[model samples]
Structures are given as C-alpha cells and as structure tokens.
Target: GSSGSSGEEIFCHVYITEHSYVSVKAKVSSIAQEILKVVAEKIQYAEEDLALVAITFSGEKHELQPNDLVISKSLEASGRIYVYRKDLADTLNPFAENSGPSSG
Candidate 1:
C-alpha cells in the first residue's frame, strides 16, 4: 500500500439512550448542532437535554461544544460519539475531567 491507511471516510456513529450508535454523515460543511438535533430526533427527546461526548483514538473523552466543527474536531477522526442526558454531564468518568482549567 502507498500511504498505509490514511483518512478514507468520516462517521458520527453516535450512541443514543446512553448507548445503536445511529449513523451520521460527513461532508465539507457539517456541524455539531445538526448532529445533536438528528440524534435528538432519533430518541424523540428535547435537544436541550442532550449533549455530544466524543472519545478519540487515544482514549481521551471530550465534551463537544455547540460551535465545534466536526471536520476540525473529531474528523481528524478515533471519534467515538455519545449522547447522554444533560443531568449526568459532570458525573461521567471522562467528563469529570472537564472541571479542570484547561478543560476549555
């Protein structure tokens, strides 16, 4: 092989109800808000009560900001997506780290 497994595709594959990972599309101009809405629609819930948590290949979990661009964010792409209830934000294992200063 020439390049040996470079970026070939993009995916959202975000989990709902705290756990099928509904599929999402990737293109030049996609954003996180759309994903939240779509995934929200899938679960029949309010978008405001949900959030996107991303797990990178390095095992780092990041709470995605509303303005986050998927192309620049996880599209770089390990990119595991999760949609959990808003109340559990600071209680999750990885999300607990978001309390630190550099969590921004």
Candidate 2:
C-alpha cells in the first residue's frame, strides 16, 4: 500500500551546516535515502558519507533510519533536516586536559 499520492511532491528544506539550507522538492512517500541524495547534491557532499536527521520546531530530533519515509518522519512541510557526515561524531572533544606539551 502507498502511504502518499503517486505523483505528489512536497518542498522540504535541508540544513547542511549551521547557516546552510537548501530547498528541494520531494515526493511525500520518498525514502530517507532519496532525500539524502538530493540534500547531499545541493550541499556538495558525497551521498555515501552523509546521513539525515529530522528536527522539529519543538527541539525533538529523529535520525532517519533505513527505509524511513520522509513525510511520516517529518510532520511539517517547512521543517528542518540536518546533514551529518558519517565520518564525524555528533560532538567532538577538541581539548583533552593534562595531555599536552611533552618534553622531547
């Protein structure tokens, strides 16, 4: 069974970085991977190295799983979808204390 119209399209906004967002048209029933490809291309990232996260206005976050439908995961048409690189962690520990400046 189809969850959405066969030929219907919806506009979605994908945020690649803090200040980068690209608007793209996608089918309501499009899978996560499909939208990922579109967003990756628009933002100039390799599709194989990126993942998508759907965040609501209320600050709820949902990482798109395999075969997940975009429309079902995203409640709003004008919502936020984040692009994350697979090679990077969500948070990085840039500074480690007491482990610097060793004598030669």
Candidate 3:
C-alpha cells in the first residue's frame, strides 16, 4: 500500500506543568478547544484560564486557537502540547528532553 492505514485514536502528551505530563487519547482530527475539554477532567483544572499550545522543532511556540485543527499543525505520535495559564505561555519553554544544543 502506498499509504499506511491510519486509526481514529492517537496518543498525545499534554503538559499541565513543566515537570509533568498527561497521556491523552485523541482523534487525528481535533481542535485545541476540544483538547482543553479532555484535559479539564484529567487535571481537574478550570479551563477558562488555561490555553493550549504546541511547539515545533523550528523553535516556534504556537498558541492553538480554539478552532485550530490538529492536522493543520501536523502533530501526531510526537505531539507536544502544553496546557497552562494564558499568562504563563511566554514564560514556558517547550521541553524536549532528548533534544538540545551543544551545551551539556
């Protein structure tokens, strides 16, 4: 087959805190708003003050709009999502434990 088969459920990592993460079951087609819904119950957090953010290898931090689709950003098995205070976005950095610059 030219293309491998795909499934409805995808595994994702959503961070509630810089030091912790949540493993979520998601659909290939999803939006940032809906993701907030799922993370709400799991983290028992008030979604009003929280926002969804994604980071790319290009060193860009994306604040996922409520209607933005997952596919648009192209994140799948390696999606790194952050759920944080709207004010905390800029202060937080995307943490890829295995990735780094030449510094030890």
Among the numbered candidates, top lDDT falls to 2
Candidate scoring better on TM-score of 1 and 2: 2
Per-residue lDDT tens digits for candidate 1, residues 1-43, read 2223335456566765233566776443457766777777766
How high a TM-score does candidate 2 get? 0.62
Off by over 4 Å in 1: 1-11, 17-19, 73-77, 92-104
Runs of candidate 3 exceeding 4 Å displacement: 1-7, 58-60, 71-79, 87-104
Clashing pairs in 1: none
**What is the lDDT, from 0 to 100, of the residue 55 in candidate 1?**
68
Model 3 gets an lDDT of 0.63
lDDT of 3 by residue, 1-104 (tens): 24353687675567765677776666677676667767766666666666677765554566767677644444344556687655554564443344237766
Residue 104 lDDT, candidate 1, scale 0-100: 60
lDDT of the candidates, in the order given: 0.61, 0.65, 0.63
Model 1 CA lDDT for position 5: 30
Query: What C-alpha lDDT, on a 0 to 100 scale, does residue 75 get in candidate 1?
Result: 38
Off by over 4 Å in 2: 1-7, 58-61, 73-79, 88-104
Q: Write the per-residue lDDT of candidate 2 for residues 42-90, one digit (tens) a residue.
A: 7566766777777777876567674677666434646677767675576
Error of 2 at 99 (Å): 34
Please name the candidate that would achieve the greatest TM-score relative to the true structure. Answer: 2
